[PDB]
Design a protein around this nucleic acid. Structure first.
Lengths: 205, 185, 51, 166, 166
RNA sequence: GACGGUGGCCAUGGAAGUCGGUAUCCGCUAAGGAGUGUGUAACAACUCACCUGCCAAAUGGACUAGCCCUGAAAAUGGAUGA
């Protein structure tokens, strides 16, 4: 049935329903490409002020806490149906948490099937191309045009967002080139309050 | 046990029109007409107005239940071939001998000379919906393109099968014309 | 010689899984000889590599 | 214990195996040595200029050369100097054989040698310092007069030295 | 039982075969043991002494032991020809990376001395080998490696072979 | 995602998760084997354990024994009687 097997949820629910009523101001984050190398260097800063707490869609076991708390799992923004989340909890630093949590990011190339964050720029132009790596990009469907003396297609505007998969042939163009345009990491979605929403705005700063 | 009813549903896009008359499905798309019979099934192929096509089977067990998903996916192949037909990409791998490839468009045939330094000319016709052309952009690659998957992939498989090293050790030589990509648009 | 072409060519006639009774190529995620001589036997090894 | 200094111009990042009588039975890699521009007789004494006495033959030690010289540096491992001060003498001829470690207490060296590798080891200090390096070797014990990780959990030494050494 | 113990094994319809094939198995084994030629000593095949043992006109008896029979056929050609009756020694040169799987093949096959391995230069080892086993070891260190490997002579006569006259 | 101490102890040109004898605890978490593998001067790099994201409802295994198939090759042409 439930509550069985290896790595039991009945020893996780002691953290997933009990310490989820002892906090003031929380950060709905994004764990869609975040490492454990980049996570251990942000889970030592939060450890003194709070915790990095998520049951990951075990959290509809929070419906029994909503008797007097009136805590929304679906009534707030980002209705939690298409993504992964690991929400950030704080006791001491409920206020200046948004600055070290958005510093330790690393820019890196993406792969195929990644969750495609809001700031992705395709490597293009003269500096974003070799004359030898054209024959890989010459394999694809789209025909090329000559701009600034190079077999290349230019796309520097944002075309993809969270919820659309990246094609498979686009991954090697980020991996082989040194072009890492965006420094990605944790992404705050909603600033959550104990029964309401504190800030219903996004702030990546 | 044979289940009472086991159906599927095929979604017809708005530019495609199916003309089915007793297990004889005939799509018509913008880019070309395609048809296949399914007279080897006890199946009532049947369309719901304009947008749906419902393969159904009353009292099938297995070897019959297993066939409705097959003949649903084949109609889906016929549909996708007549909206945005399949285009296969085939690449030349050789050790030392550069493979030459000829192509005309009478029967759209391919002719494969200097394969492993063999002097026999590997003239091969394509199945009767298919054309092909060399990739000027990517080196050592010929892209196949067509309207039906059972014609296109079979033409590609005949190119690939007829491009083998015989009487040798196939783990080392690896000279041939293999299917690389299997795109649609 | 591109390594991706060697990977593609090994995908089609080297990366197999040959049955032990039926010396017969199967796909690399097989568990059963597809042929009657084997007895549909579930005894099969990979195709050996080179060095 | 040589002192640790800042990185310099054009640092020759090296990796060595020994520190006692280096290259005794040819116990150093002769390929990590001359790949960087340095002779072999220069390279043998580098293993002892950084640690003369407390090296061991499986190491993540580091030796740096500030416009090439021996600068008395210690960017060394956290594992050599904790099983080195058990049975103290760590030379090359006595690292041909096995050894049973000494059960003489080292809680008060396991805070200075705690972060010898990196500055902040991304580990919770001041309450769990003795449950990472106190149990890092199940061979032998630190002292037989106490049993670790339970009369060593909050029973700790040093509020200012768990990240920074002496 | 008396006929079995106090008798001698007589021979059936296959006597002529189990005697002629026996005396043609005997010359095809005991004569070919350790024999190198004149002129900067090399080994060779069996059929050269199958010529040169009918050429010395050897008559083969079985009741003298096979090791003694080995020491008897080479006495006559030390008397007649200029052939060597001992071991030899080689100095194998192999590169480091692509020769270790050649090392551990012959290391439990034959005896070694002077195992001197580097990183930058070539593994040089010396051998304790019979005179005849060289022609295998000239070819097996190329047909496994796939490149060139060097045969350098060390010494031409060591005892404890058949020179102790067992 | 698959991190640190740590490249665990030992052993040696070199053996760092990944040729071997022995142990197998910790931090941080939802999740880490002192590593299920491929390879290498050893690394690196790819990879599996375990967790998590999309999803929407049944899934997986070890057996049992009915029919059937492999096992199953002989000489004139061929015999459930056809």
């Amino acid at each position: 049935m439930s509550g069985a097997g290896s790595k039991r949820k009945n020893v996780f629910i002691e953290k997933a329903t009990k310490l989820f009523t002892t906090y003031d101001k929380m950060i709905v984050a994004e764990a869609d490409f975040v490492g454990s190398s980049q996570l251990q260097k942000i889970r030592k800063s939060i450890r003194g002020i709070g915790a990095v707490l998520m049951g990951k869609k075990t959290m509809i076991r929070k419906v029994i806490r909503d008797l007097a708390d009136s805590k929304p799992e679906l009534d707030a923004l980002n209705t939690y149906l298409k993504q992964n989340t690991c929400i950030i909890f704080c006791k001491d630093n409920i206020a200046e948490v948004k600055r070290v949590i958005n510093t330790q990011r690393v820019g890196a190339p993406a792969k195929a099937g990644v969750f495609a964050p809001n700031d992705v720029i395709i490597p293009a132009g003269p500096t974003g191309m070799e004359p030898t790596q054209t024959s890989f990009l010459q394999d694809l469907k789209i025909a090329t045009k000559i701009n600034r003396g190079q077999i290349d297609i230019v796309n520097e505007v944002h075309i993809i967002k969270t919820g659309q998969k990246v094609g498979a042939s686009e991954a090697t163009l980020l991996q082989k080139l040194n072009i890492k345009p965006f420094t990605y990491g944790l992404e705050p979605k909603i600033i959550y309050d104990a029964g309401a929403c504190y800030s219903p705005s996004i702030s990546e700063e | 046990m044979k289940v009472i009813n086991s159906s599927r549903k095929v979604q017809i896009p708005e530019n495609v029109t199916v003309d089915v008359k007793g297990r004889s499905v005939k799509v018509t798309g913008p880019r070309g007409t395609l048809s296949k019979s399914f007279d080897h099934a006890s199946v009532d192929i049947n369309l719901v107005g304009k947008k749906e096509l419902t393969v159904d089977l009353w009292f099938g067990n297995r070897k019959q239940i297993a066939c409705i998903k097959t003949i649903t996916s084949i109609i889906e192949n016929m549909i996708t071939g007549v909206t945005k037909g399949y285009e296969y990409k085939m690449r030349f791998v050789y050790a030392h001998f550069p493979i030459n490839v000829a192509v005309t468009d009478g029967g759209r045939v391919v002719e494969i000379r200097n394969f492993f330094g063999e002097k026999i000319v590997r003239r091969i016709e394509l199945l009767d919906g298919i054309t092909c052309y060399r990739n000027e952009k990517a080196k050592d690659e010929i892209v196949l393109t067509g309207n039906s998957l059972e014609l296109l992939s079979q033409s590609c498989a005949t190119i690939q099968l007829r491009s083998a090293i015989k009487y040798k050790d196939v783990r080392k030589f690896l000279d041939g014309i293999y299917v690389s990509e299997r795109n649609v648009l | 010689i591109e390594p991706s072409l060697v990977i593609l060519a090994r995908k089609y006639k080297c990366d197999k899984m040959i049955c032990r009774k039926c010396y017969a190529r199967l796909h690399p995620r097989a568990v059963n000889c597809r042929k009657k001589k084997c007895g549909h036997s579930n005894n099969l090894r990979p195709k050996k590599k080179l060095l | 214990m040589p002192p640790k200094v800042d990185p310099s111009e054009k640092v020759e990042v090296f990796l060595r195996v020994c520190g006692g009588e280096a290259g005794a039975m040819s116990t150093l890699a002769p390929k990590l040595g001359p790949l960087g521009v340095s002779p072999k007789k220069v390279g043998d004494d580098i293993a002892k200029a950084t640690q003369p006495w407390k090296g061991m033959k499986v190491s993540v030690k580091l030796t740096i050369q500030n416009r090439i010289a021996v600068p008395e540096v210690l960017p060394s491992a956290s594992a050599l100097v904790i099983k080195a001060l058990k049975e103290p003498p760590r030379d090359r001829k006595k690292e041909k054989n096995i050894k049973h470690n000494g059960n003489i207490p080292l809680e008060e060296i396991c805070k200075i040698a705690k972060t010898m590798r990196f500055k902040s080891l991304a580990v919770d200090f001041k309450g769990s310092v003795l449950e990472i390096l106190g149990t890092a070797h199940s061979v032998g014990c630190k002292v037989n007069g106490k049993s670790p990780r339970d009369i060593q959990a909050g029973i700790q030494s040093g509020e200012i030295e768990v990240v920074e050494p002496k | 039982k008396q006929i079995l113990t106090k008798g001698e094994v007589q021979v059936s319809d296959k006597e002529r075969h189990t005697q002629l094939e026996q005396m043609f198995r005997d010359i095809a084994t005991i004569v070919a043991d350790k024999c190198v030629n004149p002129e900067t000593k090399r080994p060779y095949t069996v059929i050269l002494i199958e010529r040169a043992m009918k050429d010395i006109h050897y008559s083969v008896k079985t009741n003298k032991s096979t090791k003694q029979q080995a020491l008897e056929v080479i006495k006559q050609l030390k008397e007649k020809m200029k052939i060597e009756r001992a071991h030899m020694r080689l100095r194998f040169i192999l590169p480091v990376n692509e020769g270790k799987k050649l090392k551990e093949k012959l290391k439990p096959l034959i005896k070694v001395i002077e195992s001197e391995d580097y990183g930058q230069q070539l593994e040089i080892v010396c051998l304790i080998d019979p005179g005849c086993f060289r022609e295998i070891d000239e070819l097996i260190k190329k047909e496994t490696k796939g490149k060139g490997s060097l045969e350098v002579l060390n010494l031409k006569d060591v005892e404890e072979g058949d020179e102790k006259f067992e």
